[PDB]
Design an enzyme around this catalytic site. Structure first.
Site, PDB file in Angstrom:
ATOM      1  N   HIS B 101      23.017  26.625 -26.311  1.00 48.80           N
ATOM      2  CA  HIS B 101      22.873  27.157 -24.952  1.00 48.80           C
ATOM      3  C   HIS B 101      22.647  28.703 -24.939  1.00 48.80           C
ATOM      4  O   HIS B 101      23.024  29.405 -23.981  1.00 48.80           O
ATOM      5  CB  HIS B 101      24.052  26.796 -24.011  1.00 48.80           C
ATOM      6  CG  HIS B 101      24.334  25.315 -23.894  1.00 48.80           C
ATOM      7  ND1 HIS B 101      24.038  24.583 -22.750  1.00 48.80           N
ATOM      8  CD2 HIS B 101      24.960  24.460 -24.741  1.00 48.80           C
ATOM      9  CE1 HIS B 101      24.430  23.323 -22.918  1.00 48.80           C
ATOM     10  NE2 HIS B 101      24.985  23.230 -24.124  1.00 48.80           N
ATOM     11  N   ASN B 174      26.718  19.439 -18.144  1.00 44.10           N
ATOM     12  CA  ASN B 174      25.279  19.357 -18.441  1.00 44.10           C
ATOM     13  C   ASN B 174      24.518  18.644 -17.339  1.00 44.10           C
ATOM     14  O   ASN B 174      25.118  18.180 -16.377  1.00 44.10           O
ATOM     15  CB  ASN B 174      25.135  18.570 -19.745  1.00 44.10           C
ATOM     16  CG  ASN B 174      25.422  19.444 -20.984  1.00 44.10           C
ATOM     17  OD1 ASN B 174      25.503  20.650 -20.898  1.00 44.10           O
ATOM     18  ND2 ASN B 174      25.377  18.832 -22.146  1.00 44.10           N
ATOM     19  N   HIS B 365      34.712  27.906 -21.112  1.00 41.80           N
ATOM     20  CA  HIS B 365      35.284  26.992 -22.109  1.00 41.80           C
ATOM     21  C   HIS B 365      35.981  25.904 -21.331  1.00 41.80           C
ATOM     22  O   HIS B 365      36.834  26.212 -20.473  1.00 41.80           O
ATOM     23  CB  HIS B 365      36.266  27.810 -23.009  1.00 41.80           C
ATOM     24  CG  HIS B 365      37.011  26.973 -24.005  1.00 41.80           C
ATOM     25  ND1 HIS B 365      36.412  26.410 -25.130  1.00 41.80           N
ATOM     26  CD2 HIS B 365      38.285  26.512 -23.983  1.00 41.80           C
ATOM     27  CE1 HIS B 365      37.327  25.696 -25.785  1.00 41.80           C
ATOM     28  NE2 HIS B 365      38.462  25.747 -25.112  1.00 41.80           N
ATOM     29  N   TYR B 388      35.483  26.295 -28.155  1.00 41.55           N
ATOM     30  CA  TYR B 388      35.112  27.346 -27.197  1.00 41.55           C
ATOM     31  C   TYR B 388      35.971  28.566 -27.246  1.00 41.55           C
ATOM     32  O   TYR B 388      35.530  29.623 -26.792  1.00 41.55           O
ATOM     33  CB  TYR B 388      35.014  26.847 -25.720  1.00 41.55           C
ATOM     34  CG  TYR B 388      33.938  25.822 -25.503  1.00 41.55           C
ATOM     35  CD1 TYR B 388      32.806  26.119 -24.722  1.00 41.55           C
ATOM     36  CD2 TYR B 388      34.064  24.532 -26.036  1.00 41.55           C
ATOM     37  CE1 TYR B 388      31.814  25.155 -24.492  1.00 41.55           C
ATOM     38  CE2 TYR B 388      33.099  23.536 -25.747  1.00 41.55           C
ATOM     39  CZ  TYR B 388      31.965  23.863 -25.005  1.00 41.55           C
ATOM     40  OH  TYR B 388      30.990  22.891 -24.695  1.00 41.55           O
TER      41      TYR B 388
HETATM   42  C1  HDE Z   1      29.340  17.672 -21.523  1.00 41.49           C
HETATM   43  C2  HDE Z   1      29.047  19.093 -21.199  1.00 41.49           C
HETATM   44  C3  HDE Z   1      29.000  19.620 -22.597  1.00 41.49           C
HETATM   45  C4  HDE Z   1      29.409  18.774 -23.742  1.00 41.49           C
HETATM   46  C5  HDE Z   1      29.935  17.346 -23.729  1.00 41.49           C
HETATM   47  C6  HDE Z   1      29.219  19.682 -24.819  1.00 41.49           C
HETATM   48  N1  HDE Z   1      28.690  20.977 -24.503  1.00 41.49           N
HETATM   49 FE1  HDE Z   1      29.020  22.673 -25.585  1.00 41.49          FE
HETATM   50  N2  HDE Z   1      29.274  24.323 -26.651  1.00 41.49           N
HETATM   51  C7  HDE Z   1      30.174  24.468 -27.753  1.00 41.49           C
HETATM   52  C8  HDE Z   1      30.592  23.492 -28.527  1.00 41.49           C
HETATM   53  C9  HDE Z   1      30.514  22.094 -28.123  1.00 41.49           C
HETATM   54  C10 HDE Z   1      31.187  21.113 -28.840  1.00 41.49           C
HETATM   55  C11 HDE Z   1      32.115  21.341 -30.013  1.00 41.49           C
HETATM   56  C12 HDE Z   1      30.853  19.860 -28.149  1.00 41.49           C
HETATM   57  C13 HDE Z   1      31.305  18.467 -28.481  1.00 41.49           C
HETATM   58  C14 HDE Z   1      32.426  18.524 -29.470  1.00 41.49           C
HETATM   59  C15 HDE Z   1      30.011  20.244 -27.123  1.00 41.49           C
HETATM   60  N3  HDE Z   1      29.651  21.595 -27.141  1.00 41.49           N
HETATM   61  C16 HDE Z   1      29.395  19.316 -26.229  1.00 41.49           C
HETATM   62  C17 HDE Z   1      30.413  25.885 -28.187  1.00 41.49           C
HETATM   63  C18 HDE Z   1      29.733  25.972 -29.562  1.00 41.49           C
HETATM   64  O1  HDE Z   1      31.804  26.311 -28.238  1.00 41.49           O
HETATM   65  C19 HDE Z   1      29.713  26.690 -27.123  1.00 41.49           C
HETATM   66  C20 HDE Z   1      28.727  27.724 -27.717  1.00 41.49           C
HETATM   67  C21 HDE Z   1      28.923  29.053 -26.962  1.00 41.49           C
HETATM   68  C22 HDE Z   1      30.260  28.818 -26.279  1.00 41.49           C
HETATM   69  O2  HDE Z   1      30.916  29.629 -25.642  1.00 41.49           O
HETATM   70  O3  HDE Z   1      30.719  27.470 -26.468  1.00 41.49           O
HETATM   71  C23 HDE Z   1      29.076  25.665 -26.193  1.00 41.49           C
HETATM   72  C24 HDE Z   1      28.270  26.014 -25.176  1.00 41.49           C
HETATM   73  C25 HDE Z   1      28.042  25.148 -23.996  1.00 41.49           C
HETATM   74  C26 HDE Z   1      27.557  25.648 -22.691  1.00 41.49           C
HETATM   75  C27 HDE Z   1      27.144  27.031 -22.274  1.00 41.49           C
HETATM   76  C28 HDE Z   1      28.178  27.627 -21.334  1.00 41.49           C
HETATM   77  C29 HDE Z   1      27.623  29.039 -21.136  1.00 41.49           C
HETATM   78  O4  HDE Z   1      27.941  29.951 -21.956  1.00 41.49           O
HETATM   79  O5  HDE Z   1      26.770  29.191 -20.213  1.00 41.49           O
HETATM   80  C30 HDE Z   1      27.511  24.452 -21.876  1.00 41.49           C
HETATM   81  C31 HDE Z   1      27.086  24.354 -20.445  1.00 41.49           C
HETATM   82  C32 HDE Z   1      27.984  23.449 -22.721  1.00 41.49           C
HETATM   83  N4  HDE Z   1      28.323  23.818 -23.974  1.00 41.49           N
HETATM   84  C33 HDE Z   1      28.096  22.072 -22.255  1.00 41.49           C
HETATM   85  C34 HDE Z   1      28.606  20.961 -23.078  1.00 41.49           C
END
Ligand code: HDE
Ligand code: HDE
Ligand code: H2S
Ligand code: H2S
Ligand code: H2S
EC number: 1.11.1.6
Lengths: 726, 726, 308, 83, 84
Positions: B101, B174, B365, B388
């Site tokens: 993202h 999402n 998060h 997160y």
């Molecule tokens: C269902 C909505 C959703 C789901 C099921 C997941 N993501 Fe996301 N994600 C991060 C890790 C992560 C894991 C470990 C899992 C399943 C185990 C999901 N995702 C599925 C993260 C790596 O920690 C993340 C990267 C940057 C951050 O701060 O956390 C991350 C981002 C992310 C965003 C962006 C939020 C933002 O900064 O605008 C969104 C909307 C999701 N994930 C949705 C999501």
């Protein structure tokens, strides 16, 4: 409710002597002490009382005693985000310590000039005697880490951040007027030589090891600042009782564009005072925080540290009129040739609230100057200007360190710089470049001028080839060491000889000791011979015949180089141990305590246990510490009142207390039957200079004691201690 | 002064349609839009007008055009601290982008419930319809970097930070209701498979490559989300026109401690709308910033993005009542089985001031919950809780990322955590531990309760052995993909076939394509045959005989899964291209713009050059862009008014404009002599549904056009487009 | 600027008693002492003798005594990339110290079991009396910073990294068999209470201050490890003369899948010995590096620390 | 220093010289090289001053800047010649 | 349960080790500025062993109350009076 019902957990918000109350954060201890920078920090100060415990996200915590688990004996669950946030923040508390001056103690205060200096500098903070400038000052050692001891033998840092209306000015100085090396290119070589050796990381806080004296032996430019470090300059009593110096020639620039060479000084208004080596070394063990503690407690007591800013000023036309180069940072300018002009006074009057946030994260850098100041080509200063900005990128995590609250200017700051880690400021400017039309080119450049103008460098003429070359004018190494040596009292010279002797005895490779001794023979024969004798080394005929270096511009001494040649003693803020017995003569103690109070001298009542003892007349005497808990190293003098002396006459700790204070040249006063302790320190019946004794503490007993404290130590006792088993 | 005399550099601080004014930081565009969070950022906002340009230390700069050098053609000097500060800040501007993202666009807004939910949750933000909660929402793609394109085929993120009075709650969802995988342990495998491949870092923003389809063919649990991605869900028209989902079963907890399972929804009040593949891919080339621009400009215009928060609620006793497991995040809850309860409305009404400071540094998060909410054992959510918090330590430089202004709670936060890099808060608490007596144990824990209580986990019963084992109940992969497929319109099905066909054609290793087609045969034979045909693959006899999967609890479709099955169009905030000529029929234009205005539809006036043209009645019409500068890709419909058509009739760009719009199924309206264009799109004399034509632009002509626009695209046109060369 | 002609600058590469020779890097003092881990570090060991002095980019330096300037009394020039690399490296030398156990002293060695333990554990490093496992051990205090003193009153850490054939195993223990607190959630509360107080950052390396005793008085669970800390266990004579413990119940799992609960111990083969308080406290000023030094010098002398 | 995490970026394998490199710089985050030199400073006697400076010359010599003539005042000024 | 293991440790030490323990507590608590903290620690010590508690109290000029003198010592640890 866990606080005691009597409210004794909370220190009074009023000035109180050391030890009388628990110490506290400055804003809680002295809420009414204010300045513009302190007030400006209010937006980030966080309290606690009456608030709920929360996560960092503001969620109230119900049970801060347990992790979340499947059953009260089961495994901890990953969904415990309260635990993980709390442990994560803990796991990342530490930041890199400073590469040098990692050990340091700091305080808030303010500066005011005595008169307008507009004839010689357009600096706004020196323009008006009614202009008050907040300061934040950090004092430091150099070699040791942030968890090393205070009273080591080392140079001390004295750094002052001036929050001026025209920008931050940082005057980043030390407690000697020169440095060890000439060119900043060698700073990693020097520092690596003095720091713990790389295979095993020993020794901490100490130049007494092979690599340091190896480098000194191969680099005679270092000898001047080495003389200072080996003198009692290297072991100050307190950061309040050491001189400060700005190290380099800088320039002042006035409104008419005239440049004047300047070197900066701080004069301690509490006088100059140092420990002796055995005392300083033992005190790193008994209280490795002794200088941090003493600063903090002086400020809590109202004994505010005060310093006078002074300038040595040299006109541009006189650049070349000295035997030494003004740009050589291994050379001092003797006050006999160029006097220090008094400029204004700084008072440190409030401790921080949180040591990490204010002290550990403060960033000082000597390139932070303001219009009305400029640099010179001093080749040490020139490389410093690179280092102090570069180092912050790791230490403070990035280029936004000026947004860390203690570092923020109180003057406005606006520009086109954006982003970086930890970006706090949210810029609303449509433009992030100039020239721009979309924001009418704001913020805009400002021409130089007499006040509130833009910074412009003084247009110094440069001429020469691109060279890596030391100026020949820098190639003299021994005359300044010699001038220093000749300026010290005979007891100070003795302590210099003993510093060299002690340090070189810790050098394991003997040829390095020999090589150092050879260099001392190029400075002064008496000094070289006395150190040689202590090392079992005999000077060669050739060494005996090295001709001494020239006088400095005809000077054979300059008494301003000595700590003690010209008395400047001040007793306010000093402390006396008072050794109690179980039936003290209360009239003696009344006389002692009031005499001390009248002069601003503190006391600590010591005994063989904690709690109370009762005086002859029933007065209940509260005990501050035990004889072993608060050793004579921590006080300036010792008084023993009359009473039931048999109570402590045979107490080994009580006797040893006197032996240690005696060895370290401290005044000792004995009233009535306390004179029985004369046998312990071997004092003649008819007495000796530096021991006050009488039938009672009245009459001139306290006056004579205070007279001795004004002269700091009893140097005449030096031959007597030589044989004391202590 | 560099700004123009007439003030035309500065956009009006009033809502204006897309392209009417230059865009601007939100506090300058909309100074009077306020909420508690926007107000609380005032301490960090920095302006610029009328301020002097300074260093970060507050020193005014005189010359921001040159480095300091020895002569005006000489070398740059190390003492140029102004240059080095400026270049240092520049050199460290960038921080790590988000792992997934990384590409996203954000806006401030507010949320308000429709009624009190205290019967089902004690979450304070849901307790009263008067409770207004500030939000900051960031929409994102998943795969591409922060500099990748917006209209890719991808899942989209929809993250909402609620600044509640009881803590930050982040709802990190999402635009599809499931995820690709079941257990967080496989997240790095899936994400590595979708991301650019490690040898050469290709492709950006695309799942159309061997490793993605390799993982999918080997992990049938992925197939449900893959169906969504391959449908037009994967290429939304606008962040305003897609659904949002919380992805997991969470719990609501009420004041009596009762737990209700919940899944979260956002329903877009502008309706559901997506691009078509050819249009989306070309749009990544013509404007990779299309969705970011469209969001920012919708808010500038007053077309605020609105979404209704919806809950699917399932009683605790109903955990096992479905033929899928509620905790399996590759399973959706059909709305036919559990309806969405409409709970409140969120409105995004202000853009940020500085994208890096507010959007790039924002940290969302899903473990950021508040009392009234709780987790479940969903094994994907469980592992998210770890990630997160952990990821911010590098991304945002340390554990004080909550002090970054956009991240700060508006609720109080106080605790015993200290230090960490770039620590802003200066704690005055004497105590940094609990239990403590010295601060009377403040800040103190708070018992859980119906309001303002501490957080306590729901006491869910855990019984089982310590195992790394997938639940047997998760072991079904094809029924949901099939339900989704059967719920799509025939044209939505064709676009899914086309999406699999196009992606698989880009997979180099043909066995991977074959293995994916085998999986499709387990979902629906018609889908499998259609994809196989486009790939030159023939289904085997065994494949032709795979029994389809069961229906989902008796459902053979659910129209809520289609973008278009149930009419949901809203034309407010859509945009029409008007193709000018050098003598337009003014009466047509007056009518067109009046009817568009009445429905809130915007217009862009296009021609072959910039400047203006003049109407038949001398009305001067300013040109917004050329035909090539603003392609049909960027509009919802195209109108060509009458006038001098010979001017444009042989203009290739003008003709192509209509061919491209036609191919992408957009409404086209032609007035008077504009009907000469019917020939370039092969429209029969008698007309065709989706082409509006009349002698002039009267009232009926605009109603017909606006009716088409309400239905978004002209799906009946699909079999005509094959023949058009565009 | 060179070595003495007699070669007395260089320590003999043979075992020598404390003080007889200057101390030296291990690979130069004892070049014949090897183990699998020490050998595997050869890829990154860098010598020095007979090599030219260079920048980090491999460019030979002609003058390492001076900055580049315009005239020999002129300003330093920005193009001096040699000066700027050297200063930049120096300016970024420090990394964050450990939150706890920041003060510590380490050495290489090896471990072998006396007999196979395959009846109680399938761990490969315990399976054969002739399989030798390289180790790296760090001993530490707890509260003070990396530059605090060795002979403080404190708990000591005793951390062993075993480089086994089936992975790294770290046995991260202390010199007493318990800890102050029961639940990890309280670790930051306890550590903050024992660490220098947050207003003034005093005292270093000492639990003797109000916040630590406040916490203990309010959390009686701490009393057991406090008794150990106040005993002479708090002031060991040497890292060679203290016990080690693994602190927790762990499990051993054998090939049949049987779990046995286990607690780990290290017995000092040099015996148990501690200082007395006045001596320990005075030694923190006379030699704040006493334990570091003693450990290094025992290894150089051949008095290798051994533990069972 | 931010992009690649500190001052040992030349030890990242793609950045490593193939030429020899030896000097007295030490530590820094991600330090790979384990220095055995008893000295971390020069001049030193304890390692006979190695690694040593090398005079400039025709091949395999130390770097010396060309001794360009510099003359003028310390100015923030664009050359008129660039206008 | 918080007191039986400290007591077991105490009873296992030699008389000179016990003295050093008394002296460590006495030295440390003498540096605690707030006297009620020292008192509260001595009250905890009285729950472990009265001889220890008295010896510390004496060094701190503290007198144990009658109630404190009457605190029942914690149980032996599984029958052990000491473990050398
Ligand atoms: C269902 C909505 C959703 C789901 C099921 C997941 N993501 Fe996301 N994600 C991060 C890790 C992560 C894991 C470990 C899992 C399943 C185990 C999901 N995702 C599925 C993260 C790596 O920690 C993340 C990267 C940057 C951050 O701060 O956390 C991350 C981002 C992310 C965003 C962006 C939020 C933002 O900064 O605008 C969104 C909307 C999701 N994930 C949705 C999501
Ligand atoms: C004259 C007073 C003086 C002198 C001559 C020097 N130091 Fe200092 N110093 C740093 C670098 C540096 C260089 C390159 C040189 C000569 C070329 C000096 N020093 C000599 C530094 C590594 O950049 C430093 C470490 C942390 C930091 O931010 O800067 C640094 C510290 C320092 C302090 C401590 C100020 C503080 O943070 O409390 C003081 C008082 C000096 N130096 C004085 C000084
Ligand atoms: S200096
Ligand atoms: S999800
Ligand atoms: S432990």
């Amino acid at each position: 409710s866990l606080a005691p019902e009597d409210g004794s957990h909370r220190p009074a918000a009023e000035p109180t002597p050391p030890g009388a109350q628990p110490t506290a954060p400055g804003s809680l201890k002295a809420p009414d002490t204010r300045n513009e920078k302190l007030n400006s920090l209010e937006d980030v100060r966080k309290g606690s009382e009456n608030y709920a415990l929360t996560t960092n996200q503001g969620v109230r915590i119900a049970d801060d005693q347990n992790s979340l688990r499947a059953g009260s004996r089961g495994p901890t669950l990953l969904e415990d985000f309260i635990l993980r946030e709390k442990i994560t923040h803990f796991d990342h508390e530490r930041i890199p310590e400073r590469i040098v001056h990692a050990r340091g103690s700091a305080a808030h205060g303010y500066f005011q000039p005595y008169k307008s200096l507009s004839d010689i500098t357009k600096a706004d903070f020196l323009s008006d005697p009614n202009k008050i400038t907040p300061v934040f000052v950090r004092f430091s050692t150099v070699q040791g880490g942030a968890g090393s001891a205070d009273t080591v033998r080392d140079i001390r840092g004295f750094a002052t951040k001036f929050y001026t209306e025209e920008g931050i000015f940082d005057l980043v100085g030390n407690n000697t007027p020169i440095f060890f090396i000439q060119d900043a290119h060698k700073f990693p070589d020097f520092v690596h030589a003095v720091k713990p050796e790389p295979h095993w990381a020993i020794p901490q806080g100490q130049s007494a090891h092979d690599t340091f004296w190896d480098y000194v032996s191969l680099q005679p430019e270092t000898l001047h600042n080495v003389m200072w470090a080996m003198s009692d300059r290297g072991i100050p009593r307190s950061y309040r009782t050491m001189e400060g110096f700005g190290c380099h020639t800088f320039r002042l620039i006035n409104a008419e564009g005239k440049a004047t060479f300047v070197r900066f000084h701080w004069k301690p208004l509490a006088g100059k005072a140092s420990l002796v080596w055995d005392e300083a070394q033992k005190l790193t063990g008994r209280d490795p925080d002794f200088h941090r503690r003493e600063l903090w407690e002086a400020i809590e007591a109202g004994d505010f540290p005060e310093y006078e800013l002074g300038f040595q000023l040299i006109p541009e036309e006189d650049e070349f009129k000295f035997d030494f180069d003004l740009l050589d940072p291994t050379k001092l300018i003797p006050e006999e040739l160029v006097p220090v002009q008094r400029v204004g006074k700084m008072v440190l009057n409030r401790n921080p609230d949180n040591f990490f946030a204010e002290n550990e994260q403060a960033a000082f850098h000597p390139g932070h100057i303001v219009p009305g100041l400029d640099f010179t080509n001093d080749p040490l200063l020139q490389g410093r200007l690179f280092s102090y900005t570069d180092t912050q990128i790791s230490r403070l995590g990035g280029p936004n360190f000026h947004e860390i609250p203690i570092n923020r200017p109180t003057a406005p700051y606006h520009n086109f710089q954006r982003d970086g880690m930890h970006r706090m400021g949210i810029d609303t400017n449509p433009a992030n470049y100039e020239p721009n039309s979309i924001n009418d080119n704001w913020p805009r450049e400002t021409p130089p001028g007499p006040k509130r103008g833009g910074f412009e460098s003084y247009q110094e003429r440069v001429e020469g080839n691109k060279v890596r070359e030391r100026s020949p004018s820098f190639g003299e190494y021994y005359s300044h060491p010699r001038l220093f040596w000749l300026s010290q009292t005979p007891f100070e010279q003795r302590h210099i000889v003993d510093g060299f002797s002690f340090e070189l005895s810790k050098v394991v490779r003997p040829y390095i000791r020999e090589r150092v001794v050879d260099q001392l023979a190029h400075i002064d024969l008496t000094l070289a011979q006395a150190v040689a004798k202590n090392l079992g080394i005999e000077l060669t005929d050739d060494q005996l015949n090295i001709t001494p270096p020239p006088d400095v511009n005809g000077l054979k001494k300059d008494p301003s180089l000595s700590l003690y040649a010209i008395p400047d003693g001040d007793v306010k803020g000093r402390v006396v141990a008072i050794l109690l017995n179980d039936e003290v003569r209360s009239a003696d103690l009344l006389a002692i305590l009031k005499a001390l109070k009248a002069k601003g001298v503190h006391a600590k009542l010591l005994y063989s246990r904690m709690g109370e003892v009762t005086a002859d007349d029933g007065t209940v005497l509260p005990i501050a510490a035990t004889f072993a808990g608060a050793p004579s190293l921590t006080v300036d003098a010792v008084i023993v009142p009359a009473g039931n002396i048999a109570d402590i006459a045979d107490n080994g700790d009580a006797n040893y207390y006197l032996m240690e204070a005696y060895k370290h040249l401290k005044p000792i006063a004995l009233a009535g039957d306390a004179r029985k302790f004369k046998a312990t320190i071997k004092i003649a019946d008819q007495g000796e200079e530096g021991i006050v004794e009488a039938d009672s503490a009245d009459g001139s007993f306290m006056d004579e004691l205070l007279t001795l404290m004004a002269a700091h130590r009893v140097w005449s006792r030096i031959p007597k201690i030589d044989k004391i088993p202590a």
